[PDB]
Amino acid sequence: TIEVLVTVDGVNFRTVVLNNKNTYRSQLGCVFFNGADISDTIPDEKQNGHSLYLADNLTADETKALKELYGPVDPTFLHRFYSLKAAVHGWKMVVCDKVRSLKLSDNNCYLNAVIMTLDLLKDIKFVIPALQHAFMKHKGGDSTDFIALIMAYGNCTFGAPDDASRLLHTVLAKAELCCSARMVWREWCNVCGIKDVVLQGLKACCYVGVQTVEDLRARMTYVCQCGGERHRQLVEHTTPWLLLSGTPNEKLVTTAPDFVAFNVFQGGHYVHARLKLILKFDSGTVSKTSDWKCKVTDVLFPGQKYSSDCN
Numbered sequence: 001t002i003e004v005l006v007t008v009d010g011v012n013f014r015t016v017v018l019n020n021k022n023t024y025r026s027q028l029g030c031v032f033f034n035g036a037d038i039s040d041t042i043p044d045e046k047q048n049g050h051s052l053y054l055a056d057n058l059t060a061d062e063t064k065a066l067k068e069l070y071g072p073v074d075p076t077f078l079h080r081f082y083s084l085k086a087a088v089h090g091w092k093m094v095v096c097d098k099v100r101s102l103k104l105s106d107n108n109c110y111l112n113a114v115i116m117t118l119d120l121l122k123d124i125k126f127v128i129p130a131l132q133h134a135f136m137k138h139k140g141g142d143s144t145d146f147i148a149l150i151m152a153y154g155n156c157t158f159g160a161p162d163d164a165s166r167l168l169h170t171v172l173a174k175a176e177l178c179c180s181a182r183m184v185w186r187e188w189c190n191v192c193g194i195k196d197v198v199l200q201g202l203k204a205c206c207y208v209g210v211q212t213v214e215d216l217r218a219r220m221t222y223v224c225q226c227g228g229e230r231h232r233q234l235v236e237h238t239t240p241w242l243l244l245s246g247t248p249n250e251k252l253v254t255t256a257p258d259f260v261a262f263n264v265f266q267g268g269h270y271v272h273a274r275l276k277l278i279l280k281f282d283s284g285t286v287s288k289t290s291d292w293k294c295k296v297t298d299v300l301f302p303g304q305k306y307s308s309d310c311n
């Protein structure tokens with residue numbers, strides 16, 4: 001018979017007794033050993049004393065320690081996340097002039113878009129401990145845990161292509177700002193009245209629907225639920241950075257504007273670019289250009305310090 005150590009956090013361990021009659025999965029459950037899923041194998045003596053990472057059939061304790069480490073997750077999360085880690089350890093990172101980019105493999109071009117964007121976002125951190133720990137590992141130079149994690153939270157699938165902007169939302173939905181940020185929208189209807197809509201922190205740094213600063217600070221017009229001519233305009237905006245993102249939009253980018261970076265969608269393919277002339281990163285292969293015809297999807301602007309007296 002066999003006794004091994006079972007953990008879900010690499011901190012808390014319990015001993016489980018195993019025979020070598022049936023498989024790990026049948027006796028115990030989904031178990032990973034040194035990255036490998038060995039649920040459907042026979043317990044060997046050489047696997048004795050060593051530590052396993054359990055993925056299902058958790059105790060009430062382990063379940064609680066899971067929800068504190070990863071937040072509230074579905075019963076298939078841990079297996080999916082562990083599986084993804086094994087799937088993506090083969091992936092490689094290119095480093096061109098102290099800039100890290102994700103080499104192309106298994107249609108992971110969108111993950112190159114997400115991560116190269118996130119590496120520019122200043123003063124962000126994640127509330128979920130495991131994600132924040134992975135994030136600090138990623139900036140440290142080891143990105144396997146992080147890449148795997150956001151694929152897990154994003155319900156992605158290995159190999160399958162995916163919407164980069166959808167993912168950059170899910171990830172940012174779990175982050176927060178380590179500083180001050182303010183965004184005030186001012187609506188008004190003559191029968192209904194003036195109304196100020198306020199956003200603080202991260203939500204004040206990211207908008208979906210418009211691709212540039214200009215179309216953002218513009219006066220919208222529509223119909224109030226009151227039943228008349230309603231208006232809308234951004235009157236206050238203070239950020240360390242601004243992330244605007246919309247559907248793929250064809251245009252010519254010239255280099256001197258004030259973007260800092262942006263993503264492009266070709267076709268099912270993503271590219272990330274910066275402005276230090278235009279530098280582009282097509283998943284490892286770096287290029288320099290002075291102008292580009294492309295379908296921009298997300299744009300990154302520097303810190304906003306803007307006020308409008310609204311006339």
Ligand SMILES: [Zn+2]
Pocket residue numbers: 189190191192193224225226227228
């Ligand atoms: Zn009204």
